[PDB]
Structure 1
Amino acid sequence: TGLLDGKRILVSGIITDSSIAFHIARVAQEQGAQLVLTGFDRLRLIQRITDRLPAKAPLLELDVQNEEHLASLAGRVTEAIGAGNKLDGVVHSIGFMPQTGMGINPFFDAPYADVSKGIHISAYSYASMAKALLPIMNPGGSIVGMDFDPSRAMPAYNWMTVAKSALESVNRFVAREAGKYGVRSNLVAAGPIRTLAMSAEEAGAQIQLLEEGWDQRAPIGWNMKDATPVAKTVCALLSDWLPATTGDIIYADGGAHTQLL
């Protein structure tokens, strides 16, 4: 029947109805998965948004910068899914880099305190999440994080590129640790998606050009307005169908990164 039938999966990172996490969660539920959701800060808002999912799922608070949150997470998840049950899947869909580290703001003018906070949330927390949740994961399990290909520099993405580069490195080490539990760890490198995070002059035309250029570069085409292909890719990694891939990066980007022009 379903790709993820009877799988118990934690999904972090829903803040709006256009969040990549929201669509991962939707597709997961459509594929039979039982979800536990984690949210940061605006919990009333997130509750409202998660009520728009196909099925009701427990919502837990998790600020990845808060050590007490991380320390209590496994026990809170356990209360949510019942004692004796474990997670088969964990989705990290969390990213942040202050504005000083982004966009038209000069690369050299981002204070390290700002960069450090961004690396904390966007890269380090992937290890933190794994640390907190691996002790309640089943063998055969899967941890997935969200990446945006940082192998080459580019305008605007700036210090977030550096954080993603750090994330890829972190992922390779998480895989070493996860392996001990029989759990895989991977990243999905997504093409650009018009989530509300796109906010990070003539931004509109330029973002549309990004869309047209990415679609042209991608041999199978690309639609920035549609998170679904990315959500399906995450679910694939959550499933039993990529059992020998770990510490690795799957590109759900239309194939654009394989083409120079």
Structure 2
Amino acid sequence: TGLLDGKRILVSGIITDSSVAFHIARVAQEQGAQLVLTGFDRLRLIQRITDRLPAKAPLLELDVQNEEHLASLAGRVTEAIGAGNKLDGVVHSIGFMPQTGMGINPFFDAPYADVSKGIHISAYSYASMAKALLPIMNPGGSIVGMDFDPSRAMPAYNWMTVAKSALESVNRFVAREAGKYGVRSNLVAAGPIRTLAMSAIVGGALGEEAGAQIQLLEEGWDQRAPIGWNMKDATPVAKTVCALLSDWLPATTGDIIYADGGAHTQLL
């Protein structure tokens, strides 16, 4: 009863109710997991968002660039879950890439300070979280990060794709570390999901050509997906994360599960 029954799971990256992490949290709760959530900057907001989750979850502040947040995370979570209790699950659902770098908008014009911020938050923070959290994880545990397939360049996502390549590589190293703890580390490569940032982009937040490109990306995904892809539905990805959080992929680590409708297996 419950895929995640009895599992304590930290889920980062809720910012709105359309956040992939919101759905992960909701599905994890539906599946019996006890959550601790982390949020970055707008904690009153995140608290209010997360109140809609089917169960209460302690919400902790984690700015993955901080250091002090990271240093105290583990302490703050064992406090939230009770001393002598450890994490079974950690969800990294964190990403960010500044400007220009990202849409439209010339790849070449992103200053390294921005790329570096993006990679910090989007890639390196995966190692950071695993470092902060593996000491309070149980054998049989699972770390899952949110990915998208960056093995081919694409329009618009630019430096964010680079950040995901870095992340996928970080993941395979976290796996090496996580393994000593009996902990899996895996990524879920999602197809495009109409998250608030994503609808803003397709709406022209980042320029016409950025939005046009993402819309094209979305349509081609779905077409390519042998089972289709619904970008308005984060649930198939929430669930895939949960499958990774579960004991049902026990021999899978340093790996990437594609929750993308199979689009990446296809070409056309």
Tell me the TM-score normalized by structure 2. Answer: 0.95
Determine if contact 2:123/2:167 at 8 Å carries over to the other structure: yes
Give 1:104 deviation, angstroms.
1.3
Q: Distance in 1 between matches of 2:63 and 2:214?
A: 30
Give the alignment's Cα RMSD to 1 decimal.
1.3
Q: Match of 2:208, SS? A: coil
The residue correspondences of 1:111-190 to structure 2 (distance < 5 A) are 111-190=111-190
Distance 1:160 1:207, change over 3 A: closer
Distance 1:165 1:50, change over 3 A: same
Give 1:212 deviation, angstroms.
2.7
Q: Match of 1:245, SS? A: coil
Q: Match of 1:100, SS? A: coil
Mapped pair 1:8 → 2:3: no
Q: Distance in 1 between matches of 2:181 and 2:210?
A: 45
* Residue from 215, 218, 232 that aligns with 2:222: 215
Give 1:209 deviation, angstroms.
3.8
Give 1:105 deviation, angstroms.
1.4
Q: Distance in 1 between matches of 2:151 and 2:211?
A: 26
Give 1:20 deviation, angstroms.
0.1
How many residues are treated as equivalent by the alignment? 261
Q: Distance in 1 between matches of 2:63 and 2:54?
A: 25
Q: Distance in 2 between matches of 1:224 and 1:259?
A: 18
Q: Distance in 2 between matches of 1:169 and 1:47?
A: 32
What's the CA shift string for 1:28-54, capped at 9, x where partnerless?
Answer: 000000000000001111011000110
Q: Match of 1:18, SS? A: coil
Distance 1:204 1:102, change over 3 A: closer
Give 1:213 deviation, angstroms.
1.8
Q: Distance in 1 between matches of 2:149 and 2:240?
A: 15
Determine if contact 2:103/2:210 at 8 Å carries over to the other structure: no
Q: Distance in 1 between matches of 2:209 and 2:118?
A: 26
- Unaligned runs of 5+ residues in structure 2 are 200-206
Task: Name the counterpart of 2:209.
Answer: 202
Give 1:57 deviation, angstroms.
0.5
What's the CA shift string for 1:75-105, capped at 9, x where partnerless?
Answer: 0001100011000000000000002111111
Give 1:203 deviation, angstroms.
6.3
Give 1:183 deviation, angstroms.
0.3
What's the CA shift string for 1:103-138, capped at 9, x where partnerless?
Answer: 111111110011011010000000000000000000
Distance 1:107 1:202, change over 3 A: closer
Determine if contact 2:89/2:137 at 8 Å carries over to the other structure: yes
Q: Distance in 1 between matches of 2:76 and 2:36?
A: 10
Determine if contact 2:90/2:143 at 8 Å carries over to the other structure: yes
99-108 vs 216-225, greater mean Cα deviation: 99-108
Task: Name the counterpart of 1:44.
Answer: 44
Q: Match of 2:45, SS? A: helix
Task: Name the counterpart of 1:97.
Answer: 97
Give 1:251 deviation, angstroms.
0.3
Give 1:180 deviation, angstroms.
0.3
Distance 1:179 1:202, change over 3 A: closer
Give 1:197 deviation, angstroms.
2.1
Q: Match of 2:248, SS? A: coil
